[PDB]
Amino acid sequence: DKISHKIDIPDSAWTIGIGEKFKNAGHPNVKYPMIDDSYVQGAPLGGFGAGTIGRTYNGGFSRWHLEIGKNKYTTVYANQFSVFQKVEGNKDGVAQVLYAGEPENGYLSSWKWDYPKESGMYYALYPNSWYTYTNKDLPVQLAVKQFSPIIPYNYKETSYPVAVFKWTAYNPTNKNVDVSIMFTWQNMIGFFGKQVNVNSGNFNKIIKDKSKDSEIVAAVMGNISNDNEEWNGEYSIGVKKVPGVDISYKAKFVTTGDGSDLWHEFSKNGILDNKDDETPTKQDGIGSAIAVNFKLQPGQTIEVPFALSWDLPIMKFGGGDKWYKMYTKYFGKNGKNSFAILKEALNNYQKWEKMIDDWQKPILSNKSKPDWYKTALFNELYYLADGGTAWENGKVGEKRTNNMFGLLACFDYNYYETLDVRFYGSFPLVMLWPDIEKQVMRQFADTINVQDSSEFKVGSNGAMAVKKVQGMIPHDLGSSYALPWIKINAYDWQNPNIWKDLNSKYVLLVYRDYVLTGKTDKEFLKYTWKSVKTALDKLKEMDKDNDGIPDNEGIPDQTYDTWSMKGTSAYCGSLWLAALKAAQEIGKVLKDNEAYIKYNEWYKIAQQNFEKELWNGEYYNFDTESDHKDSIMADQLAGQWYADILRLGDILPKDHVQKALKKIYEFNVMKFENGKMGAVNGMRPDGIVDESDIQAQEVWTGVTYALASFMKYRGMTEEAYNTAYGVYKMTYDKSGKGYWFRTPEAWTKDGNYRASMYMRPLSIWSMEV
Ligand SMILES: OC[C@H]1O[C@H](F)[C@H](O)[C@@H](O)[C@@H]1O
Ligand SMILES: [Ca+2]
């Protein structure tokens, strides 16, 4: 490997061999079908709300999130980079597709597939990823850096449906070598959203943009229809000319054929026919190819940028609503703008690289932090793009001031902005994209007094319940299968209108968003204040026994939605205490004296009774009335965790908090698989995992990262990082279960999982507060 010295990969990048088989991989541990796309994954490309494309460590474009809210795992084999090399003096050169695999059927059989093992590496530190190619049959070594401009405090470039592929080629040998790099792409119009005639009318054109000291050559792959539908738009691939490279292209090759129309040209001398052809297709799939060719002398290095863009302006959800995607603000809505997007990337990628380096640098340069922690911190952010992210710029047919936003909990539980989960998972938004965060919270504020008296069947017990109760915060803002932002509470496994955590978590999120953006945004507190008061007042009515604390009802009436709580729970009780203290403080900021006094009174009574009911001398009991009420819960002091972040001080005695955290580390971490897999949710005081429910026997990745954050604030530094390390290890390490770029909600002691691609582990960013 002589190419790594010519590029700048951070030591904390996650790494794997191209074509590496992984032997330890986990699978779903549930009864019903659950997504398992395998361990062949990579860091995604594409902006927030743009739709994303997962290019895996084997080189294939395989995890398709272009249909917003859906996960489709299938390798589009025509989408590749390929290389040609010929040493001066030899009769023939060699050509190779840079993909460690081959097609299942006979399409593209002429191409040279099966990139060999032990001949290259993949690296990822989101939003960047890299491939190096160090192959004994390729004398010139190559590397690519690929990325999308995902940039904190930037709501523009961060939305773009674009990827840059910055190639570096170096000749370590003593002979001249002719080199070509080719990007191929299928015209994917009709890949989704078209019920019949899926290729019909697709056509490709070549754009040559020649301006002094600029040449870009690009293929635009679109459809003859000017219809404005979810399926219609354009894809573009292209390259910017640099000194010493020549550009060639082929506008149209057949993807549903043997591929020799293209490959016979590329494999001969690395130079394509430059054949334009705008003839639309009928049944056949078609694609385009953009190539560069250059000669590298001994010791010479050259850099060349390619790019990919996709202009699919309309997202459609299953309930029938069509919305424009955020990036349309910047490029237009007509779906004929893929070249403009591509051109912007090709002309500005160096600036974008520097902007990404500027934001990563504070963390990467901190030599007190171990590299594994940096690997997790950056790569967990993949989910902000890959979580079915929806970000609207108007309803089709509709002009408002704000752009509504939603992140899925996951794809198996297809619910936007699940608030009980976002309590953990929204840290990167408040810390890095706070205008999005506040918009999402205003969305929730607006739902507080919505009433929908129509009834739904509760999944857990078959009983009927009201969809949405006035003054109760919703579980979610809908489903991609129905009507995001419009029809809330798509979730039906339990009735969220009786949950005891949602209203408190809402208030805690509001105050968090004020505190972590500098305690300056009084207008945000003013906007949300009525909803905060309503939320707490409604929750107070669920106190059955007049101890000043809402009573859990012997059912799963909170985020642990199969784990029953009864009476006063440590979890919901501590959240309530903290929410009361937050509301007191907002009351002071907004000069609402009567609110301050009321929530102060409620807080004092609740705090006294919480401590009396639950403090056992070593930790806080799980709750007051359940069968295993003395279980040690990993999340028992979630309210105190948030109180630390919100700078609300002690809600419980410092000494008791420290004892409880040490107990959790000693039991839930260290007695669960020797502390190498995170914190199990429930442990009995005899040191055996609590078996009352599956959720008690699970490690929750986002809960564990949050607990690590809590330990860190409380000065338990070793315990914090050891606790978090288990999650990193399981996710990323060779000794783990292969969950990179699909971190699940949960695993059991065998390492098998529930709900890959989950929002909650974004909570790792609470470790950076
Ligand atoms: O894993 C538990 C988790 O499962 C689903 F995502 C639910 O919608 C969430 O409310 C719940 O917290
Ligand atoms: Ca009570």
Contact predicate 270/140, CB 8 Å:
no
Q: Is 396 helix (H, G, I), strand (E, B) or coil?
A: coil
Block residue for tokens 């040191």: 687
Q: Is 258 helix (H, G, I), strand (E, B) or coil?
A: coil
In angstroms, the CA 699 to CA 748 distance is: 6
Mutate-to-test residue for ligand 1 from 411, 421, 758, highest number of ligand atoms within 8 A of CB = 421
Of the ligands numbered here, which is closest to the C-alpha atom of 548?
A: 2
Contact predicate 337/234, CB 8 Å:
yes
Contact predicate 464/383, CB 8 Å:
no
Kindly state the tokens that stand for 112: 């040279």
Is the omega angle on the peptide bond into residue 127 within 30 degrees of 0, that is, cis? yes
Contact predicate 331/340, CB 8 Å:
yes
Q: Is 466 left (phi over 0), alpha (psi -120 to 50) or beta?
A: beta
HSE of 677, CA atoms in CB hemisphere, 13 A: 24
Q: What contacts 513, CB < 8 A, 6 or more positions away? A: 430, 434, 437, 438, 441, 521, 524
Give, to the nearest 10 degrees, the angle between helix 638-645 and helix 570-589: 30
Of 388, 145, 403, 95, give the one whose Cα is nearest residue 264.
Answer: 95
> What's the residue count for the chain?
769
Q: What contacts 437, CB < 8 A, 6 or more positions away? A: 426, 429, 430, 513
In angstroms, the CA 477 to CA 496 distance is: 12
Which atom of ligand 1 is nearest to 745's Cα?
Answer: 1
In angstroms, the CA 51 to CA 426 distance is: 20
Kindly state the tokens that stand for 43: 């860091």
Q: How far is the CA of 582 from the centre of ligand 2 (A)?
A: 20
Of 576, 725, 550, give the one whose Cα is nearest residue 642.
Answer: 576
Contact predicate 275/166, CB 8 Å:
no
Kindly list the distances between the CA atom of residue 606 and the CA atoms of 541, 580, 581, 618, in Å, as whole numbers in the listed order.
14, 9, 11, 20
Contact predicate 190/378, CB 8 Å:
no
Dihedral sign for Cα atoms in the order 732, 733, 739, 745: negative
Of 524, 529, 522, 572, give the one whose Cα is nearest residue 547.
Answer: 572
HSE of 600, CA atoms in CB hemisphere, 13 A: 11
Ligand 1 lined by 421 (C-beta under 6 Å): yes
Block residue for tokens 């902005």: 417
Q: What contacts 112, CB < 8 A, 6 or more positions away? A: 82, 94, 95, 96, 97, 263, 267
In angstroms, the CA 57 to CA 61 distance is: 10
In angstroms, the CA 606 to CA 612 distance is: 10
In angstroms, the CA 602 to CA 577 distance is: 9
Q: How far is the CA of 410 from the centre of ligand 1 (A)?
A: 9
Which atom of ligand 1 is nearest to 754's Cα?
Answer: 1
Long-range contacts of 412-415 (CB under 8 A, 24+ apart): 412/34, 412/35, 412/755, 412/756, 413/491, 413/755, 414/69, 414/388, 414/479, 414/480, 414/481, 414/490, 415/475, 415/476, 415/477, 415/478, 415/479, 415/490, 415/491
Q: Enumerate the H helices of 367-515 as residue ranges.
A: 371-379, 382-386, 419-425, 427-432, 434-447, 502-515
Helix (H) or strand (E) holding 524: helix 522-540
Dihedral sign for Cα atoms in the order 561, 566, 570, 575: positive
Q: Is 164 helix (H, G, I), strand (E, B) or coil?
A: strand
Helix (H) or strand (E) holding 342: helix 338-364
In angstroms, the CA 152 to CA 92 distance is: 49
269-275-281 Cα angle (round to 5): 125
Q: What contacts 705, CB < 8 A, 6 or more positions away? A: 424, 724, 727, 761, 763, 764, 766, 767
In angstroms, the CA 96 to CA 135 distance is: 11
Q: What contacts 126, CB < 8 A, 6 or more positions away? A: 43, 150, 378, 379, 380, 381, 382
Contact predicate 675/724, CB 8 Å:
no
Kindly state the tokens that stand for 64: 């398709």
Q: How far is the CA of 610 from the centre of ligand 2 (A)?
A: 9
Give, to the nearest 10 degrees, the angle between helix 522-540 and helix 570-589: 140
Contact predicate 578/511, CB 8 Å:
no
Q: Which amino acid is at 70?
A: K
Which atom of ligand 1 is nearest to 491's Cα?
Answer: 8
Provide the b/e sequence for 216-247 (b: ≥16 CB within 10 Å): bbbbbbbbeeeebbbbbbbbbbbbbbeeebeb
Resolution (A): 1.6
Helix (H) or strand (E) holding 699: strand 699-700
Block residue for tokens 């809590």: 710
Contact predicate 313/328, CB 8 Å:
yes
Please provide residue 439's backbone torsions phi and psi, each rounded to the nearest 5 degrees: -55, -45
- For residue 390, the Cα-to-chain-centroid distance in whole angstroms is 12
Q: Enumerate the H helices of 690-769 as residue ranges.
A: 701-713, 717-732
Kindly state the tokens that stand for 641: 């965790």
Residue numbers belonging to the annotated binding site for Ca(2+) = 543, 545, 547, 549, 551
Calculated CA dihedral for residues 688, 692, 694, 696, nearest 10 degrees = -50
Of 438, 373, 479, 415, give the one whose Cα is nearest residue 768.
Answer: 373
> Sheet of 699-700: strands edge to edge?
699-700, 746-747, 753-754
Kindly state the tokens that stand for 715: 């000065």
Provide the b/e sequence for 742-751 (b: ≥16 CB within 10 Å): bbbbbbbeeb
Calculated CA dihedral for residues 346, 352, 357, 362, nearest 10 degrees = -170
Of 532, 683, 712, 695, give the one whose Cα is nearest residue 618.
Answer: 683
Q: How far is the CA of 516 from the centre of ligand 1 (A)?
A: 26
In angstroms, the CA 728 to CA 377 distance is: 9
Q: Encode 279-339 in three state secondary structure.
A: CCCCCCCEEEEEEEEEEECCCCEEEEEEEEEEECCEEECCCCCEEEECCHHHHCCCCCCHH
Q: How far is the CA of 617 from the centre of ligand 2 (A)?
A: 22
Which atom of ligand 1 is nearest to 700's Cα?
Answer: 1
Ligand 1 lined by 719 (C-beta under 6 Å): no
Q: Is 446 left (phi over 0), alpha (psi -120 to 50) or beta?
A: alpha
Long-range contacts of 404-409 (CB under 8 A, 24+ apart): 404/439, 404/443, 404/485, 405/49, 405/436, 405/439, 405/440, 405/443, 406/440, 406/477, 406/478, 406/484, 406/485, 407/383, 407/759, 408/69, 408/480, 408/759, 409/476, 409/758, 409/759, 409/760
Where do breaks (C to N over 2.5 Å) occur in the chain, by preceding residue number?
A: 398
Of 505, 500, 525, 514, give the one whose Cα is nearest residue 595.
Answer: 525
Q: What contacts 692, CB < 8 A, 6 or more positions away? A: 563, 564, 626, 627, 628, 631, 682
Contact predicate 142/169, CB 8 Å:
yes
- The string of DSSP letters for 747-768 reads E-TTS-EE-SS-SGGGGGGGGG
- The string of DSSP letters for 422-457 reads HHHHTHHHHHH-HHHHHHHHHHHHHHTT--EEEEEE
Provide the pairing of β-strand 52-55 with 405-406.
Answer: unpaired
> Sheet of 141-147: strands edge to edge?
14-17, 120-125, 128-133, 141-147, 162-170, 301-311, 234-240, 214-223, 202-211
Of 433, 136, 80, give the one whose Cα is nearest residue 263.
Answer: 80
Kindly state the tokens that stand for 332: 């237009």
Q: What contacts 227, CB < 8 A, 6 or more positions away? A: none
Q: How far is the CA of 476 from the centre of ligand 1 (A)?
A: 10
Of 59, 81, 274, give the one whose Cα is nearest residue 179.
Answer: 81
Mutate-to-test residue for ligand 1 from 30, 34, 413, 763, highest number of ligand atoms within 8 A of CB = 413
Kindly state the tokens that stand for 656: 């008791």
Helix (H) or strand (E) holding 576: helix 570-589
Helix (H) or strand (E) holding 132: strand 128-133
Helix (H) or strand (E) holding 14: strand 14-17
309-742-671 Cα angle (round to 5): 160
Kindly list the distances between the CA atom of residue 83 and the CA atoms of 72, 86, 113, 115, 663, in Å, as whole numbers in the listed order.
28, 10, 11, 11, 57
Kindly list the distances between the CA atom of residue 507 and the CA atoms of 67, 446, 502, 669, in Å, as whole numbers in the listed order.
33, 14, 9, 30
Q: Is 189 helix (H, G, I), strand (E, B) or coil?
A: coil
- The string of DSSP letters for 138-155 reads -SSEEEEEEE----TT-S
Query: How deeply is 674 buried, as exposed, middle or buried, from its count of CB atoms within 10 A (0-12, 13-18, 19+)?
Result: exposed
Give, to the nearest 10 degrees, the angle between helix 434-447 and helix 522-540: 40
> Sheet of 52-55: strands edge to edge?
44-45, 52-55, 61-65, 72-73
Long-range contacts of 455-461 (CB under 8 A, 24+ apart): 456/492, 457/492, 458/492, 458/493, 458/494, 458/495, 459/492, 459/493, 459/494, 460/493, 460/494, 460/555, 460/556, 460/561, 460/562
- Looking at residue 537, the DSSP 8-state letter turns out to be H
Kindly state the tokens that stand for 86: 């010929």
Block residue for tokens 């001066």: 88
Of the ligands numbered here, which is closest to the C-alpha atom of 408?
A: 1
- The string of DSSP letters for 191-257 reads SSS-SS-TTTTEEEEEEEEEETTEEEEEEEEEES----STT--EEEEEEE--TTEEEEEEEEEESSS
Q: What contacts 247, CB < 8 A, 6 or more positions away? A: 215, 217, 239, 241, 290, 291, 292
